[PDB]
Amino acid sequence: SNPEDLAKNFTKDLYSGDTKSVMSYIDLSEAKSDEEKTFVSDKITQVVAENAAKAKRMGGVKDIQIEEKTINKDSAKIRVLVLFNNDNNQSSNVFLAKKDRKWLVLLK
Ligand SMILES: [Cl-]
């Protein structure tokens, strides 16, 4: 409901192996055909499988933190840092937008 917390929960779910959870965060407005939606879903299915295998390899996620942020009333770019229990960390940007009364992650 605030974009910082949506960025962090999205990221938690991205490393959790649960594709339906991850999908619920995503704005599918760019994908303007059923076949495009499927394509996006198939890629998210794959990303979720891969991040779950990787979290396991790295001893699981230790913490999730926000490093840089740029937020206004309807858009957000948020660098989310994932810290793993093997002491390695990884970061990347989550882009979000509030089109109606709901923040959603944008497909970059
Ligand atoms: Cl790796």
Q: Could you say which DSSP state residue 26 is in? A: B
Length in residues, the chain: 108
Q: Could you tell me the domains of the chain?
A: 1-108 (3.10.450.50)
CB 65 within 8 A of CB 75: no
Q: Give 29 Cα–ligand 1 centroid separation in angstroms.
A: 31
**Alpha helix stretches (DSSP H) within the chain:** 3-14, 19-24, 34-57
**Per the structure block, which two tokens stand in for 34?**
């059923």
Closest CA to 1 of 55, 80, 76: 76
CA 66 to ligand 1 center in whole angstroms: 21
- Resolution for the entry shown, Å: 2.0
- Contacts for 84-93: CB closer than 8 Å, 24+ residues apart: 84/55, 84/58, 84/59, 84/60, 85/58, 85/59, 85/60, 85/61, 86/58, 86/59, 88/58, 91/67
Beta carbons of 27 and 106 less than 8 angstroms apart: yes
Distance (Å) from CA 99 to ligand 1 centroid: 34
CA of 58 to the centre of ligand 1 (A): 9
Cα of 32 from ligand 1 centre, angstroms: 33
How many whole angstroms from 98 Cα to the centroid of ligand 1? Answer: 32
Taking the centre of ligand 1 as the mean of its atom positions, its distance from the CA of residue 2, in whole angstroms, is 30
